[PDB]
Design an enzyme around this catalytic site. Structure first.
Site: not given
Ligand SMILES: CC(C)N(CC#Cc1nc2c(N)ncnc2n1[C@@H]1O[C@H](CO)[C@@H](O)[C@H]1O)C[C@H]1O[C@@H](n2cnc3c(N)ncnc32)[C@H](O)[C@@H]1O
Ligand SMILES: CC(C)N(CC#Cc1nc2c(N)ncnc2n1[C@@H]1O[C@H](CO)[C@@H](O)[C@H]1O)C[C@H]1O[C@@H](n2cnc3c(N)ncnc32)[C@H](O)[C@@H]1O
Ligand SMILES: CC(C)N(CC#Cc1nc2c(N)ncnc2n1[C@@H]1O[C@H](CO)[C@@H](O)[C@H]1O)C[C@H]1O[C@@H](n2cnc3c(N)ncnc32)[C@H](O)[C@@H]1O
Ligand SMILES: CC(C)N(CC#Cc1nc2c(N)ncnc2n1[C@@H]1O[C@H](CO)[C@@H](O)[C@H]1O)C[C@H]1O[C@@H](n2cnc3c(N)ncnc32)[C@H](O)[C@@H]1O
Lengths: 258, 258, 258, 258
Positions: D45-46, D142, D144, D156-159, D217
């Site tokens: 698929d890539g 807030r 990733d 793909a990613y969605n699943k 990709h």
């Molecule tokens: C420097 C920044 C980015 N902070 C400080 C903190 C904290 C932190 N500690 C905790 C903890 N013990 N228990 C409950 N909540 C906490 N908080 C809270 O977390 C939120 C985001 O800081 C705020 O409300 C914080 O008060 C780093 C922490 O961010 C978490 N982090 C990163 N990416 C994340 C994501 N995508 N989803 C969820 N968490 C994510 C992770 O633990 C990293 O250490």
């Molecule tokens: C260039 C590379 C990285 N590929 C090609 C492809 C495909 C792709 N299409 C599909 C699709 N329609 N339905 C079902 N599977 C699919 N595949 C498969 O996906 C796996 C990883 O490529 C392999 O088995 C593929 O045959 C990119 C795609 O990678 C997915 N991707 C990225 N990060 C991911 C993650 N963390 N988790 C899950 N998926 C993630 C996303 O869709 C991106 O477009």
């Protein structure tokens, strides 16, 4: 007794810090940010994480305290209205939480301690790491990354990844996936995994050998990594506690209502 | 030494049972299903759960062993090809896993021990229970039900509910939700919760007071329930182990590949 | 024009109903609960579901309206403060949402229409159903049950099961699992599945042939079921709309903030 | 008719490509990689995603076909054993799948088409974006990142992010979260969201204005982004289909068994 105070650096936290230093000046308390025995962090949990890492090499000699100048923190679990009350108390029991030991091996070796978690993510797109548990190949992970959390870290990144919330009296670490691929070719466990002390979880590269490794708030691109090894640390962080504020109540207060 | 053998009751398990009784007859082993010291279960994990509950009142006097006559079990982790080898060994070390204590209070009181989990579900539709942790009101749950799992139970119902897999050396219990309602009016934590020993989780009715309560394979409608209380038991189940078959490998073998 | 008003039956909803009947008496509006053209439901979404099923055999002749005497509903999306304003308007455009057709075959046949969802659950423990999509065997499901949702139903049971929220202008139905078993022996897709019009999803028994089948608020144990067949209905429910209250705003208002 | 063949570039795919060019040479087929009417992709698929983007500016003039030289693909759904059979057929009906239109606004504007998905992720740690749906502020995210998927992209990613699998005859796009923060301060919907045609989803920065935006990709760091706007495209990708291979069977074959 020697103490120091870190501040978030906004107007509210700086002024609270200065007012607490004044209060401590009325007791036999010496401000010392080189060898404190008490570390007070005024801000939120991010400030508290920075305080921990600022003094991580003297953890067994320090009791930490956190004051939240915004909403309730899990570490910063004291309100600014009790700052004056806290000075009098400092001049208590200690509570200890487990920590996560992270070892990064190249081709030397570096160790880090985490209070919340350590994660590994790709230098772009999905990356592939073999996961080895106590020298036993457990799975080949393809996806966005992996998160290894302490108990007190389970309410942070770990929770947003679907991990369980674990009472911090449990000496364990918890591994959660970020967006794994699962099809007829690729297979992971999916579920979070909880490991006791003395279990070692090794992450090893498959093709690409560059990764982003985070430890708490600190993220660092590591080149020529051969292995990332996780184990519950023998080291612990110590809190000064002056009242009962149960963990499960901190959870209720942060996520359910307050 | 006194032993007994339970069978799944299909042709393969019955014949294996009879062949092992013959083997034991060549040693100083007495078949006794009233006071066995060794309980061998031949079947799958359902058979093993039945063996546990058949002898739950003499758990500290018994070492259990499971033989799987189908696929690998987490409890029934011996293959029929090693039946003859196992007889010779029986005639070893012991490994102990934690158990879940469940107390049901009416308006007297009944206690049950679970090897996998205890659940509570509604007498139809969603039901409402207040969840109290160490006497502290934690949440009001509205939804299909709740599941409290042991460590070795985490690979069973708990896993299908999104719970974490926990190494059974950890003395803990894990609470998971079944389909909670979450809107502006109703709020739950959502995440699985992991509790250490001596924490008590109480479920209490809000309107309806009838529930279906399960303990392992046994489901029973309880009328006029006032409370369901969960705590890690002081009692433990003991396995006879003759070789190293690590838990994480049993997980790999059951869910990843084999 | 003929109208009728259903009430939740508490003091607030009954009095609002009586006050609206008085208002309608000042126009050329005839109260008729046998052949209404307008059906007003005062209560919450449960009341609105009951109104729908009370008049489901005359759906193309009726425009429904819901007034919420508690919190905002997805169906009951008018506030009691606008009751007088609503009478004047009734005496408008129409908006139509898709419905779910459920067919139950025995060994005759019965059909039901769902506004939120239809589910199938076991007569105890996990049950086993083969899932056939357009006559193609898709999976063998072992677990607690299955939920087939309409678009407007996606914010209800479907959401608590991890399903996607779907704008109701999409003519589709969405299937979600309740606690499936997944190990080396049992396999399901896990993900919610979204089907367009003219796709047919058939659930068929494997051993046990008794099931609990729900349609919206109505749950019924069906004996000797051979098949449960789901398809997007050709029938639609019509709402009277007097202002713009977008679905995505109703979602925001119910789950994010208000 | 003009055709071209892309290859994954391994020995198996290159040789299959050369053998199919030989076969086409026996018909009135002209190899033309500038203005093909038929685009055959040999690989997985890539490779197929790369073919789509190589010819995305002439999508309405092209019918695509995918041959998988490894495991079954969702796009590359023909086996190499039918290469000779496929040449004869080419020298059929067409099937069209919806596409995702992505608009990136700075402070000019750039548009991209996605066959699987477009995502937005942070320049490190969690990032913050306001999510606006049809000009209505829906949530402040807030975490990733966010993933907007087409129907055929839902496997793909969605699943892996928990999204629903949607039959590609549905003209819609699906938004899923990556690790959102949810506490008393931060709130997201959590559930995947499915949007019909003519709905516009706008992502807007809050503090940091740099993001990583992917389209299939292809991942690209965009500086000084003011807005990322998602809508179902008016453009569609066309497949040449020679036999019935239903989408739900491709799902079964890739994730359940084969
Ligand atoms: C420097 C920044 C980015 N902070 C400080 C903190 C904290 C932190 N500690 C905790 C903890 N013990 N228990 C409950 N909540 C906490 N908080 C809270 O977390 C939120 C985001 O800081 C705020 O409300 C914080 O008060 C780093 C922490 O961010 C978490 N982090 C990163 N990416 C994340 C994501 N995508 N989803 C969820 N968490 C994510 C992770 O633990 C990293 O250490
Ligand atoms: C260039 C590379 C990285 N590929 C090609 C492809 C495909 C792709 N299409 C599909 C699709 N329609 N339905 C079902 N599977 C699919 N595949 C498969 O996906 C796996 C990883 O490529 C392999 O088995 C593929 O045959 C990119 C795609 O990678 C997915 N991707 C990225 N990060 C991911 C993650 N963390 N988790 C899950 N998926 C993630 C996303 O869709 C991106 O477009
Ligand atoms: C009497 C029957 C119903 N069994 C016996 C067993 C076992 C059991 N033990 C375990 C275990 N330690 N670890 C891993 N797998 C286990 N198995 C397997 O579980 C499947 C179903 O029995 C089979 O493969 C078993 O070998 C009861 C158990 O069924 C679980 N159960 C009920 N409803 C469920 C659901 N909807 N989803 C997932 N699990 C569900 C639960 O634990 C209950 O105790
Ligand atoms: C007779 C009772 C039980 N109601 C009335 C309603 C409604 C209903 N409609 C919707 C809807 N379109 N969108 C958003 N919310 C809705 N509500 C709310 O749902 C909550 C519970 O009624 C209340 O806030 C309702 O205002 C039946 C509905 O209950 C859902 N249900 C059952 N068991 C569930 C569970 N375990 N988890 C989540 N939902 C579950 C299901 O849809 C069933 O039809």
């Amino acid at each position: 007794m020697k103490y120091m105070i870190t501040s978030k650096g906004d107007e509210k936290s700086d002024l609270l810090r200065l007012n607490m230093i004044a209060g401590f000046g009325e007791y036999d308390m010496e401000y010392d940010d080189v060898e404190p025995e008490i570390v007070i962090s005024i801000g939120g949990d991010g400030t508290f994480l920075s305080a921990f890492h600022q003094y991580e090499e003297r953890l067994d000699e320090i009791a930490f305290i956190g004051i939240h100048t915004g909403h309730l923190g899990f570490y910063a679990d004291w309100r600014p209205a009790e700052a004056d009350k806290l000075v009098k108390l400092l001049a208590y029991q200690k509570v200890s939480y487990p920590l996560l030991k992270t070892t990064v091996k190249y081709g030397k070796e570096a160790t880090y301690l985490a209070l919340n978690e350590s994660t590994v993510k790709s230098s772009g797109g999905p990356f592939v790491v073999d996961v080895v548990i106590n020298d036993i190949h457990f799975e080949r992970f393809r996806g966005d990354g992996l998160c290894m959390s302490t108990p007190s870290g389970t309410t942070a990144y770990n929770k947003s990844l679907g991990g369980a919330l674990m009472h911090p009296s449990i000496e364990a670490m918890q591994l959660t996936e970020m967006a794994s691929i699962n099809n007829r070719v690729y297979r992971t466990i999916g579920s979070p995994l909880v490991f006791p002390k003395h279990h070692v979880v090794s992450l090893q590269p498959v093709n690409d050998k560059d990764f982003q490794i985070s430890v708490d708030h600190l993220s660092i691109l590591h080149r020529d990594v051969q292995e990332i090894r996780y184990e519950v640390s023998a080291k612990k962080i110590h809190f000064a506690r002056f009242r009962s504020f149960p963990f499960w109540r901190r959870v209720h207060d942060s996520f359910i209502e307050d």
